[PDB]
Every structure is written in structure tokens, then in C-alpha cells.
Design a protein around this nucleic acid. Structure first.
Ligand code: CA
Length: 294
DNA sequence: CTATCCTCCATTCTCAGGTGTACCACC
DNA sequence: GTGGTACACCTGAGAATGGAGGATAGG
């Protein structure tokens, strides 16, 4: 599978994690060991992607049981990381707030690169980085380093290439199918199609840009947190804007299968074969086997 | 000592799957 | 006053987030 670059970058922007890890091993010089990882974790169904991803990075890292149903691709070697992973994400930049995480990550590996992690001044610096990464410094660690100061998250700020969006959407996107109980329809149910991209409110500026990017969409915000939902319910737009896009820039992973069954429904709908009881049944079967289950 | 390998979590973050009802069609 | 559609709102399971120790292989 080709799996061009931009789809990868996007897919990571959505699902990827860069971790900098600091652990006390009194067997060291600064009573602390500093590890750096690049991890992707996915369901059993999407194992083929990880292997295609491993391949993509010239067979680097390892794939291994992570959760009860999940598996993890990881490059934990700093030589390897600095050799293959960085030169990539320098050339093909992330555009999400991840870019900030990676950027810090990059600095930690350069420090490691010069052996300045094995020193004291290097450690304090490296901790200042981690402090600005992910959820951030954590419990045990903070209490060990208080006189400290998290490093400023960088000035991040544009969708570089369509395929980014294909990949990105494969990670955090959603091709919903709804069966609504209507009281004013011959068959008792309204058939609906919804395309949905979920994300944290940090990336509000990017999310707003999609609307302009796809010429359609009505982003909104969760009621109970800083979660945004770029959404498309307008069937005519689904028909003429969403489908023809992802048809040309194909979804990578298990989701693609959904997108297909989704399209299948959208035909049953375009033909109006959704207001028949037969058409309804044809849709249910589709509904019931796609996304959840199958 | 230093770096990479390996086998395990727990809690939040996205997914996914509903509505309510305004406005549209119709004529 | 029928037969249909699209926002705007609502609410939860359970995997992704982002970790956690080890035990080693390279010194
Ligand atoms: Ca994600």
C-alpha cells in the first residue's frame, strides 16, 4: 500500500502521541533515566495499518499488545528516532497543536543526542520541556523538581495537502448513520447521514478553516467541555462535496469500510429508496454492520 | 552506568446514536 | 394540513491518551 506521506502526517496529527519519559533509576548518574517514544495505538481491526505504517518508516519500531483489545506501534530508540522520525516531521510538518508537542519532543532528543541528558543541567532543561508536553508534568516528577519553569509552547500560528485531511479524518473523524423516529413519515423513520470531525477546542482556528476548505459545514461546541464538532448534516452537501472528496483522497484504515457502506446508504437515499419499508430494511442491515459491530 | 527491549494499566476523549421542532415542501 | 428535511441539543461506553515498571542488551 502506497500510503503517501501527507495522509501519515494527518493521521498522526489526529491519533499520534509523542511522549518524553523521566524515571528514577538510582543506578544512573543523576538518579534519573530519560526515555523518548513515538506511539500509535489502535484496535485489533486496524493492525494492518500499523504494519503498513512500520513499513512506511522503513520497518522501524515494534508492534505489540497494548490494551485488552488494542495494539501499539512504538519507536522507543533515540538513535532510530533521530535517524528516521525527525527528518520526516521536519519535512512534512504537523499543523495541529501536536506540532507543539512534537517540536518540544524534538528538542529533548537533540539534548539526548549530545548526551546532555546524562548531566544535571540537561535534566532540568529536559524536565522543563516535558512539563509543556501532553497532560504535562506528573505527580512524583513535579514534587522532585519544583524550582523549575515549564518551557513556553511555541508560536504555532493551514491544511498543506488534501491527503492530510484524508489521514487526519481517518483518526478522529466519523461517518454516522442515524435512524430517527419521525411521526410525519410513511415508514416511521427519518434516514439521516452525518459527517463529523471531533477535536479539542485548542484547534478551533483549524476546525473553522475546514468549512472554508470543504465549502460546507456548521461547527459547534460541546456543552460539557472544550470539545468541538465540525459537522455536516445537509444531505445535498454530503452528496456533492463530502463524498466526491474522500472518493479521491481515500480513507486509510478500517473506517474506509464504513465510508463505503455510508456511500451505499447515500445511494439508497439519493434514489429516494429510503421512504420505502424495503429501502429502510436495506439501510438497517447497512447501519447495523457498519461502525459498531460488523 | 547507559540504552533499548518487554509486558502491563486507569481515566479521559473521542467517537456513536439518539431528539425536538422549525421550516420545507407540496399542492 | 400531508410527507419530508436539517440544525441545535443531548448523553454515554470504552478505547485512545499518555502513561507505569521491568528486564534486558551495549558498555
Ligand atoms: Ca485522537
Amino acid at each position: 500500500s502506497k500510503l503517501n506521506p501527507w495522509a501519515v502526517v494527518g493521521f498522526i496529527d489526529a491519533e499520534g502521541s509523542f511522549m518524553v519519559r523521566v524515571r528514577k533509576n538510582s543506578k544512573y548518574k543523576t538518579g534519573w533515566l530519560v526515555v523518548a517514544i513515538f506511539s500509535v495505538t489502535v484496535d485489533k481491526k486496524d493492525l494492518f495499518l500499523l504494519e503498513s505504517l512500520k513499513t512506511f518508516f522503513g520497518g522501524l519500531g515494534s508492534i505489540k499488545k497494548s490494551g485488552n483489545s488494542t495494539f501499539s506501534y512504538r519507536i522507543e530508540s533515540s538513535e532510530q528516532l533521530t535517524k528516521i522520525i525527525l527528518p520526516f516531521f521536519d519535512k512534512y510538518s504537523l499543523i495541529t497543536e501536536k506540532l507543539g508537542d512534537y517540536l518540544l519532543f524534538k528538542k529533548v532528543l537533540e539534548l539526548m543526542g549530545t548526551k546532555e541528558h546524562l548531566t544535571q543541567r540537561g535534566l532540568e532543561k529536559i524536565v522543563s520541556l516535558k512539563a509543556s508536553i501532553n497532560k504535562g508534568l506528573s505527580e512524583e516528577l513535579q514534587a522532585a523538581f519544583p524550582q523549575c519553569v515549564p518551557t513556553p509552547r511555541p508560536e504555532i500560528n493551514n491544511i498543506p495537502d488534501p491527503f492530510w485531511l484524508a489521514g487526519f479524518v481517518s483518526g478522529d473523524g466519523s461517518f454516522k448513520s442515524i435512524l430517527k423516529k419521525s411521526e410525519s413519515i410513511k415508514v416511521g423513520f427519518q434516514s439521516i447521514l452525518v459527517f463529523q470531525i471531533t477535536q479539542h477546542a485548542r484547534d478551533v482556528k483549524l476546525m473553522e478553516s475546514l468549512i472554508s476548505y470543504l465549502g460546507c459545514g456548521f461547527i459547534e461546541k460541546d456543552s460539557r467541555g472544550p470539545w468541538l464538532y465540525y459537522t455536516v448534516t445537509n444531505f445535498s452537501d454530503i452528496q456533492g462535496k463530502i463524498i466526491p472528496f474522500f472518493h479521491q483522497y481515500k480513507i486509510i484504515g478500517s473506517k474506509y469500510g464504513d465510508y463505503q457502506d455510508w456511500c451505499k446508504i447515500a445511494l439508497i437515499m439519493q434514489n429516494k429508496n429510503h421512504l420505502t419499508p424495503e429501502g429502510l430494511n436495506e439501510i438497517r442491515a447497512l447501519k447495523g454492520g457498519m461502525n459498531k459491530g460488523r
